[PDB]
Write a protein that binds this ligand. Structure first.
Ligand SMILES: *[C@@H]1O[C@H](CO)[C@@H](O[C@@H]2O[C@H](CO)[C@@H](O)[C@H](O)[C@H]2NC(C)=O)[C@H](O)[C@H]1NC(C)=O
Ligand SMILES: *[C@@H]1O[C@H](CO)[C@@H](O[C@@H]2O[C@H](CO)[C@@H](O)[C@H](O)[C@H]2NC(C)=O)[C@H](O)[C@H]1NC(C)=O
Ligand SMILES: *[C@@H]1O[C@H](CO)[C@@H](O[C@@H]2O[C@H](CO)[C@@H](O)[C@H](O)[C@H]2NC(C)=O)[C@H](O)[C@H]1NC(C)=O
Ligand SMILES: *[C@@H]1O[C@H](CO)[C@@H](O[C@@H]2O[C@H](CO)[C@@H](O)[C@H](O)[C@H]2NC(C)=O)[C@H](O)[C@H]1NC(C)=O
Ligand SMILES: *[C@@H]1O[C@H](CO)[C@@H](O[C@@H]2O[C@H](CO)[C@@H](O)[C@H](O)[C@H]2NC(C)=O)[C@H](O)[C@H]1NC(C)=O
Ligand code: NAG
Ligand code: NAG
Ligand code: NAG
Ligand code: NAG
Ligand code: NAG
Lengths: 417, 136, 194, 97
């Protein structure tokens, strides 16, 4: 009824969220897949209407959708902010997430790790069957430039650049803003600035090791690539199906049979191959819808976790969200969520209100806690016991109404003077 | 072994019946063609992107029979630029960077701009306006 | 099942999901928001409710002075929840509909086993017996391609409904995080009212 | 210009939101569905090739997705918190939940 646990310490925790933002843009040459080198098959395929045109239209829509997904996730900011030449930032070290000029790609070490992790030839065999891959509109370097601009804006201006012009603020003061956002006073940060910076640096260092050690850490990205490749391979393998015809080779059917019998066999083969293409395009549309949902989530997390501090629980990591860092990954984004985790909790006796004179006093911003003999007022998320005064408490009514009210003195600052 | 098949059970190599000389079969050069147009209202000028080929190897057909598009006039033209999406013929690459107007790919976009006859130009897309926050 | 369509058991037993709900709800009662964001910190429930009153813009004294009234209102509302669920047939319709859709779709698949698809019969053995093997094979392949089309249609509609269920489950997980493990200021995300 | 409405009382309102998190997990046999007992039809089926490989893969993906959905909704907390033996809670009654 009267026991409260108040955390006496904190942990700065950096976690990774990996979100696919785009999939492989694929184009199918419908004639080359249904009728590789048979002109007779092509002339017969002309009689099937706008099937190939509709498939091309759907695949082009998917490719434009992928480019739009990447634009929405990464091109949110219209200013390419640059980090200052002197990278001090109050003892917070961003070298692992900031772009590295030594690398030719101007990519951060963590992003370089992410790009390394995600991976006749199959490409040539697929191309020879009419299946080709279109390059994304934005290069990996351009997406890295977006990520670097977002990081520079976040570090130098906090969340101001997200809501308008970028407003420079010292990074310790920005992180103090964020502690105010999570309900912790600024003095907790300024008094523990070195500890918070060291914890953040250690967590960021452990991020790279965690990504390296686990092969499946970026599996959500890899699966997407896999889900594409298998599909294409399936399509290629579906070119071996006779579909009830004498052969799976159009040239053999034409060479062996007169026109009436060949028509019945080429019709079977063409119908089967068009069905395979339709199945591929339909499943690609479903996967594209899933990737669009993932990219919409990534854009929302870019807006609310990177361009601001979110009060939504678990939207931007596990704990009380402080800030987030975007990192480009092959066909996706990795968000490094820096959150505040209470730790080293201690038991205290608690009361809803303090009865002084005939008046009930309630904490203006905190809790009434007791170490066993003395009563203090403290903030909820950090143990900072303070003398109960009229300044930090407000008066409402008599002591009779409140259940659990405790007698205690409320010090009046002005009375000594 | 008379012949060889690929994954799709399509013959990719064959042994010549007379000479017994082993021959690889590669399908004749093929690729996608994309037409970049500023809009028929604006102009009738176009650019052609030959996708996934170096335009060292773009159609150089000199006779109508040799290749399926009978429009050779936009092949190996005056304006030739190599992109990772393909090679673009009919658009002049400019070192200036602008906001994307017609997406081509690999960071290259195209736009119909005055420069003073107005023509199709290709460029690297501009990510935005550079800025440096006065951090202290 | 005898026609080849089987139902796989869910990995989590309903008892395990009940234990998850029990753990979440016990954590909510004993610790408020704290277990969601880290270690569970003990809080008296009236004080947690006073915190939640502060979250909506109402001072703590309003809850403390009206603690009995607020508790009675909550108890009465929770009592009315069970009756409201009982009375409305469509109260859990969103659940039943999903089951119905699945149950209905399978029947369609089963019914597509009684379709000739242009052939003489829907029974393969009858077609083989009553026709020459070359002539019979054409009708048999017609039946086979019809049944493959039926299976592909079922799988495509199941993929679309699975995407819809995934969207619903993502929303449910977001509501677990933001409404159960925290107090949400998003309007109408966690019910009508503050 | 000058009139405001200020609440003098409140109602504690409990409402219900119903959300489906998973669907029935189904598995399909081409061999039995297409060719109930015909080995001849079973042999003919191989001509169409990898359709059922793809269909089984899609259905298995849906089935794994359902368990993933349930994990996402209900397995949020990794500590199985236990309710206190004494259920007072300040006059709030949670016996129904
Ligand atoms: C809060 O926790 C931090 C650890 O995250 C404590 O700092 C460590 O303290 C131990 C022993 O005092 C040292 O051996 C470590 O080197 C310290 N680590 C860092 C990063 O400073 C800190 O003392 C705790 N604070 C309180 C008040 O308990
Ligand atoms: C920021 O952190 C990086 C590593 O995450 C620091 O670079 C390391 O510095 C130590 C000692 O100077 C070397 O032993 C390591 O080999 C360095 N590693 C890398 C990857 O460079 C860097 O010095 C830190 N920055 C500041 C200002 O302290
Ligand atoms: C509870 O806190 C009070 C205030 O900090 C403690 O009283 C102080 O005790 C120290 C010795 O530890 C004295 O130097 C101070 O003069 C005391 N202050 C007052 C106002 O009396 C008290 O000892 C604590 N009790 C427990 C059980 O920890
Ligand atoms: C606020 O509303 C509650 C009811 O929701 C009021 O409580 C009622 O008070 C009257 C008179 O005191 C009783 O006859 C009823 O039985 C009470 N109902 C319940 C459910 O307790 C309360 O008085 C109202 N407060 C104000 C200031 O109007
Ligand atoms: C909490 O509510 C339950 C009902 O949901 C109360 O149990 C009821 O108690 C009354 C009187 O004791 C009986 O007439 C009912 O039959 C009970 N119903 C059920 C479902 O058990 C329970 O008493 C309440 N708890 C407290 C502490 O009052
Ligand atoms: C105090 O807590 C105990 C056990 O948790 C409970 O039995 C008792 O009813 C509570 N106090 C009041 C006044 O209800
Ligand atoms: C608080 O007290 C309870 C019971 O005395 C104990 O189980 C718990 O571990 C204590 N918590 C802390 C942080 O001391
Ligand atoms: C302390 O609280 C008790 C409990 O009701 C009360 O009887 C007493 O008057 C209080 N002491 C004061 C108000 O000085
Ligand atoms: C251009 O095509 C030629 C011809 O094969 C090739 O050798 C060369 O590598 C290509 N250049 C580029 C930049 O792709
Ligand atoms: C008060 O309201 C009236 C009518 O609604 C309006 O005409 C008037 O301008 C308002 N007062 C002022 C100071 O504008």
């Amino acid at each position: 009824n009267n026991s409260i646990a108040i955390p006496t310490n904190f942990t700065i925790s950096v976690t990774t969220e990996i979100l696919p933002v785009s999939m492989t843009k694929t184009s199918v040459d419908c004639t080359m897949y249904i009728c590789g080198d048979s002109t007779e098959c092509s002339n017969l395929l002309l009689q099937y209407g706008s099937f190939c045109t509709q498939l091309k239209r759907a695949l082009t829509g998917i490719a434009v959708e992928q480019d739009k997904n990447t634009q929405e996730v990464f091109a949110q900011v219209k200013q390419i902010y640059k980090t200052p030449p002197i990278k001090y930032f109050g003892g917070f070290n961003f070298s692992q997430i900031l772009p590295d000029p030594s690398k030719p790609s101007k990519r951060s070490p963590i992003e370089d790790l992410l790009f390394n992790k995600v991976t006749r030839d199959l490409i040539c065999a697929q191309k020879f069957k009419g299946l080709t891959v279109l390059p994304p509109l934005l290069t990996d370097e351009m997406i890295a430039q977006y990520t670097s601009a977002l990081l520079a804006g976040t570090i130098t201006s906090g969340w101001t650049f997200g809501a308008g012009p970028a407003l420079q603020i010292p990074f310790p003061m920005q992180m103090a803003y964020r502690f105010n956002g999570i309900g912790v006073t600024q003095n907790v940060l300024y008094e523990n600035q070195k500890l918070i910076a060291n914890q953040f640096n250690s967590a960021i260092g452990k991020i790279q090791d965690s990504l390296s050690s686990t092969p499946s850490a970026l599996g959500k990205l890899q699966d997407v690539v896999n889900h594409n490749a298998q599909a294409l391979n399936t399509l290629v393998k579906q070119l071996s199906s006779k579909f009830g015809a004498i052969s799976s080779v159009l040239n053999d059917i034409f060479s062996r049979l007169d026109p009436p019998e060949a028509e019945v066999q080429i019709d079977r083969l063409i119908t089967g191959r068009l069905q395979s293409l339709q199945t591929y395009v339909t499943q690609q549309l479903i996967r594209a819808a899933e990737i669009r949902a993932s990219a919409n989530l990534a854009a929302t997390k870019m807006s609310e976790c990177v361009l601001g501090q979110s009060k939504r629980v678990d939207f931007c990591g596990k704990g009380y969200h402080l800030m987030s860092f975007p990192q480009s990954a092959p066909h996706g984004v990795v968000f490094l969520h820096v959150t505040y985790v209470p730790a080293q909790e201690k038991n205290f006796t608690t009361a809803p209100a303090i009865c002084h004179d005939g008046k009930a006093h309630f904490p203006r911003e905190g809790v009434f806690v007791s170490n066993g003999t003395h009563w203090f007022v403290t903030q909820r998320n950090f143990y900072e016991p303070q003398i109960i005064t009229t300044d930090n408490t407000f008066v409402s009514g008599n002591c009779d109404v409140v259940i659990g009210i405790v007698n205690n003195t409320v010090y009046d600052p002005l009375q000594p003077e | 072994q008379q012949f060889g098949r690929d994954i799709a059970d399509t013959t990719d190599a064959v042994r010549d019946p007379q000479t017994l000389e082993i021959l690889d079969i590669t399908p004749c050069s093929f690729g996608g063609v994309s037409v970049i147009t500023p809009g028929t209202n604006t102009s009738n000028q176009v650019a052609v992107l030959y996708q996934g080929v170096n335009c060292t190897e773009v159609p150089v057909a000199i006779h109508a029979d040799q290749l399926t598009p009978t429009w050779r006039v936009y092949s190996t033209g005056s304006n030739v630029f190599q992109t990772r999406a393909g090679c673009l013929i009919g658009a002049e690459y400019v070192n200036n960077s602008y906001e994307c107007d017609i997406p081509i790919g690999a960071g290259i976009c195209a736009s119909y701009q005055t420069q003073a006859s107005q023509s199709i130009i290709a460029y690297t897309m501009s990510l935005g306006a550079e800025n440096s926050v006065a951090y202290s």
